[PDB]
Design a protein around this ligand. Sequence first.
Ligand SMILES: NC(=O)c1ccc[n+]([C@@H]2O[C@H](COP(=O)([O-])OP(=O)(O)OC[C@H]3O[C@@H](n4cnc5c(N)ncnc54)[C@H](OP(=O)(O)O)[C@@H]3O)[C@@H](O)[C@H]2O)c1
Ligand SMILES: NC(=O)c1ccc[n+]([C@@H]2O[C@H](COP(=O)([O-])OP(=O)(O)OC[C@H]3O[C@@H](n4cnc5c(N)ncnc54)[C@H](OP(=O)(O)O)[C@@H]3O)[C@@H](O)[C@H]2O)c1
Lengths: 261, 261
Amino acid sequence: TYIPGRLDGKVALVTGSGRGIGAAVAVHLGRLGAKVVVNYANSTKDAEKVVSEIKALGSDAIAIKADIRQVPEIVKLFDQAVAHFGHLDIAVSNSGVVSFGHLKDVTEEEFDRVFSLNTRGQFFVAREAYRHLTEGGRIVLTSSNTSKDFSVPKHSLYSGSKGAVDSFVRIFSKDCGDKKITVNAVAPGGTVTDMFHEVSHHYIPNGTSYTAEQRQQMAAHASPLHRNGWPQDVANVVGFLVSKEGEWVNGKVLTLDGGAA
Amino acid sequence: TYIPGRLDGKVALVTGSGRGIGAAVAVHLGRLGAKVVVNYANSTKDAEKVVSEIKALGSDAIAIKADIRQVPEIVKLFDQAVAHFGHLDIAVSNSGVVSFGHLKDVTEEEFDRVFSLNTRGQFFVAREAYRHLTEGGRIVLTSSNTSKDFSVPKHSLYSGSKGAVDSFVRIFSKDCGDKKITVNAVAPGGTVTDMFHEVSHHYIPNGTSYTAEQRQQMAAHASPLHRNGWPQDVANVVGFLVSKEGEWVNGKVLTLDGGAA
Ligand SMILES: NC(=O)c1ccc[n+]([C@@H]2O[C@H](COP(=O)([O-])OP(=O)(O)OC[C@H]3O[C@@H](n4cnc5c(N)ncnc54)[C@H](OP(=O)(O)O)[C@@H]3O)[C@@H](O)[C@H]2O)c1
Ligand SMILES: NC(=O)c1ccc[n+]([C@@H]2O[C@H](COP(=O)([O-])OP(=O)(O)OC[C@H]3O[C@@H](n4cnc5c(N)ncnc54)[C@H](OP(=O)(O)O)[C@@H]3O)[C@@H](O)[C@H]2O)c1
């Protein structure tokens, strides 16, 4: 009785896994048999619930605080992971922030706020993952449908931040091959989280004239499956990418929008 | 009387047009009838020769020093352009630096060196272009075949800096449409300049024992036309994009590699 995609004996790290997509990814990898490093920057209590949830399904996990904007903290995060669990096999770079603004109004401060986490942060999470990971490991970064597949006015900064990631993973796969580590990205479409409700009004003309429920309902019709994307959808795909069965998917960006594009 | 393809009565600015691709673009736009702002960071003499060349073919030009890494100098550059010529119609963002290195070895310093110019710099050149341009104007940024079309080991940092640019211009076209300004990028393949010779050993099978000239000869075979790309090849395409007749190409990235991909 073959059960595919188990991660028994494996150790995974997920950045920003206290809440949102990261949280569901972390719990799912735990459910699949992996021990999990739950990284957070702010959401201490949320991260501890995630740790508790993973332990409850019969795995093990630890919540570690690190600001992914700070490269020395990324280094420390990965050293702590290895010192605690003994090895690290899977690294999922998930932390990101969203941004909207007409090009004409984008400040230096906002450019840097976004790129420092979404692009620079993810680049050095991948570097540190390469440095710490066991042979035959897995690195997954997080892009967006807005990188290439979906054009939203006033969304250039954020779209660009993930466009860089798409290019990163393709070349990362070449470099990381010398340790047989695969490197991919997931590019979610609208996925129901704190970030989604924060900006749902942009995926519609005007959009501020609807309730959060109406906007969510309207977003559900983007997919021909007529439902919203959920953190579990992303987790399902990350789970496969980081499994043994996922190996021949390498250097690729998978847009996870339920067929919207 | 308007002449099709020409740029008579227009004012153009090219970043880093003292040498390399920028210089060819700047001279070509001058040849097409545009008055030209020739930006440089270091190459004073080269920039002045560019200015003289544009004057020799019956147009006008001024060289203006500005470090494109510095957003306040971009502002200054565009301010001076508008003060000097009365208006600015065309902005070409060309300045860039190359980088190679395995992911594992990439430093904070190198990441920032590359992104501050290639990505952040170009983003803010686009912001200042929008801010200063006449209605119906043109903005072109510079990407690379390595963004999406060509994978080179140890080239993740630079490849990603241009992948951001690809996504930027697609969305910039939406924002800038409210002034009828088109925004595109050119994505050169290997193009014979100082930059090409620094890195051409990465582009060919095993070119270790080969001097610059031999590496260039070998790289000439990537294109099914069996020649190298030249700065004039890029200038030729820029000249069309920034013309009236180029209007319906908007929000796009054109890979200019003579058919190699
Ligand atoms: N949800 C969508 O519709 C959507 C669509 C496309 C792409 N994405 C991408 O999917 C990823 C997750 O999005 P989400 O919807 O789950 O976002 P979210 O609900 O806003 O959650 C953000 C996550 O990022 C973490 N984080 C923020 N700043 C951090 C920092 N400096 N260092 C470390 N972690 C930090 C947060 O942890 P703390 O609370 O501890 O700060 C939190 O866990 C992001 O990369 C996002 O760009 C989301
Ligand atoms: N050549 C290729 O094979 C190739 C391939 C793909 C993409 N590209 C892209 O095409 C563009 C031009 O490349 P190229 O081959 O002409 O490069 P190059 O020969 O190295 O020339 C670089 C140009 O950028 C300018 N520059 C450098 N730093 C600057 C700064 N801080 N501020 C303002 N300007 C600065 C330089 O001016 P100063 O001398 O005054 O510093 C110079 O004019 C770049 O964006 C490059 O990434 C080139």
